[PDB]
Design a protein around this ligand. Sequence first.
Ligand SMILES: NC(=O)OC[C@@H]1N=C(N)N2CCC(O)(O)[C@@]23N=C(N)N[C@@H]13
Length: 812
Amino acid sequence: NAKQVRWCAISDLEQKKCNDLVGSCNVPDITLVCVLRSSTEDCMTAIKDGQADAMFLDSGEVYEASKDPYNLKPIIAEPYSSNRDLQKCLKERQQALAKKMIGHYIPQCDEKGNYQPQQCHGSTGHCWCVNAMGEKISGTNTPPGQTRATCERHELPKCLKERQVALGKVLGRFVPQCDEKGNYEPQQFHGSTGYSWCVNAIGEEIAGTKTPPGKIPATCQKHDLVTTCHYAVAMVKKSSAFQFNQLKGKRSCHSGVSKTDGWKALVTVLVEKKLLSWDGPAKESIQRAMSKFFSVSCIPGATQTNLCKQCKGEEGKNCKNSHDEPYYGNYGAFRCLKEDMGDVAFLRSTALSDEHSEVYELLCPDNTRKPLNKYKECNLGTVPAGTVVTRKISDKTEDINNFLMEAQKRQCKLFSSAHGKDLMFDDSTLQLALLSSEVDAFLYLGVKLFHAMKALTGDAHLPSKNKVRWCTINKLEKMKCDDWSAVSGGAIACTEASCPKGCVKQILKGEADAVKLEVQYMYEALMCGLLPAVEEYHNKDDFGPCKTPGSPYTDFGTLRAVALVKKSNKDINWNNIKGSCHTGVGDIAGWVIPVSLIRRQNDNSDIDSFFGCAPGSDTKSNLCKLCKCSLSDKEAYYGNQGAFRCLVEKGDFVPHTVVFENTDGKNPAVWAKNLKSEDFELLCLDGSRAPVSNYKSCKLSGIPPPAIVTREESISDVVRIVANQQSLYGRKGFEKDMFQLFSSNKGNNLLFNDNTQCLITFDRQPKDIMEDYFGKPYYTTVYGASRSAMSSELISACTIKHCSNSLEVLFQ
Ligand SMILES: NC(=O)OC[C@@H]1N=C(N)N2CCC(O)(O)[C@@]23N=C(N)N[C@@H]13
């Protein structure tokens, strides 16, 4: 029935606005309640205690909020416009139609879902022109009763036109590789010359990343072009004459001690410019070093008296993280500078307006001054948007989201008030969208910014070059790793995660050093800059590579994905497979490799309508009938052998080893006992029906081996410690009676697969690391040889956001 959402207010003005929303905003079955506290930190505590449910935090406060004594988590935030947004016109049309208002602009889309080149605001009669991303072409807005601008289609991305400008007069210049939708691949390979280099979002080469053919190519990050960026700036009056390197001793006003635009961006610049004498957060609090840097200041929330001297709040509210302090916030910091209580104001660029351009200007970190409109060139760094937070337990996230989504639909005045600016939310907020429940402080801030916040609060870990922290995914692995650590002589330590993805995050966060990953997780890990140090070797026939490291191997023990049929017992070939059964929807050989080939050779729909048992593929489906159909042992057609039972029972895609298993009498069953290796064989493309013994040639694809990944700067140490530990323990080790790497009484396949022969150091080749790990057939088949084949919250956190006024640049 009726639920309630308790919003926390840090000030009297915020409670006045919040109570206005309680009266004027009617959301059915949700009741808004306003809880009052005296500061930002007291509101975070109230949410932690269950006294309130939601509040809005600056991005600079997200990291500290995620820890004791707050333990808060971002749930709702304003989305930015990226150059990777799909079906944007359709989504934007739905949102506008969802608004409970009449006469608002509703974007117009064609049949394909693209923007119509001309967009009109029906209620006002104004029309304008737009590119493929919906951005208004400058100057094309016309009122009713006036000749309209004629609108061209701007649908050709920047790269795709460069392909056919270089494809041309039989020249020899280079052609770029770009993923679908025309975006530049971050890694570029020159066809004529073995050179490799890397580009940003708009395809221009970054810098020192070009490499000759014989050398290892650079490790290069995915870039995204994002619009509307806000910046941290230092604002000063034109009357003053000092520059940035003369800030010491001056009077300053800051939006807040915990805010990026008021403190954290400034401290980063002061340290990099060597203007701030600071030993470090372990030796000295950053506030103490800053207290000696400035003479007197107003920095709301500060615990040094001189940093609170210039504040204007009445006693009990002076220097508080609250609008009760008149100088709090971006506009509060501007007010102090206006009233000559400080010589410089540190605030967000959103508080800049052309009205201030007469008296005010910007203080640039290169010791120059520039006008306000040059803030994109005169700033202390980008500031990501704030976010709504709640408890990590996330008990009331659903109720909080339903309220804000409904309040936005009903045009409630969330982002403005007569009482003041930036109350409850940033006034610049256009909309708030729900975040994935996977998102936390690390994923929201991103890998680079997270470490900057971690280092700034003195939680930065420095890994020991002589110890490897190994991440586990369950209690049994933790027990075996503890057994390993106790016999490692300080070389091995153990961390705990719930899944391999969590282990990858811990390595990126600096909380762990190494983990073994199956093939499914390698795409994200390699995308985030991790690298394989050692890999599981499974060739039980050859021991040369294990006994002596560096000696070559003939077969790494890889599985090969193949399609097994009987020899003309059935007359099937690859080209008439329409009208087979698979191990499982998630398995690589059973599903990933075949389905990737199918969709690649004729762009269509595999989900159904291509075949005439594939567990985990819904029910009442084309294949789920042949099996019920659960991705579980309880289905008798699940797994490697389960897919073998399907080939014999109404047979029409498995690893190569499965046929040799059960055959020749190996599996005691009523069905698969009296069949032999001459009865079955495999489908190759265009070749077909090799005697199942010609795999490695009659294969759909090879499957790369499991890899142990780590950071690039930890590669040499991890392999060194693993190699030393492998000589002691594991198969044929000096102290193998003390402990075993590839077997355990705690369980099976802990940390590594128990059938692993040994770990072999990864031989890196002068090739793309995605190709270098996966191999060209697997990389091309499964992921299209592209860095954009899959997207996720983890990959987004590992993606560099590159600011641009508009996406327009990608179209001309
Ligand atoms: N075939 C094979 O099994 O490869 C063994 C080992 N492991 C890989 N995942 N690779 C990726 C591709 C590759 O070149 O085959 C190899 N690449 C390097 N640096 N060592 C090889």
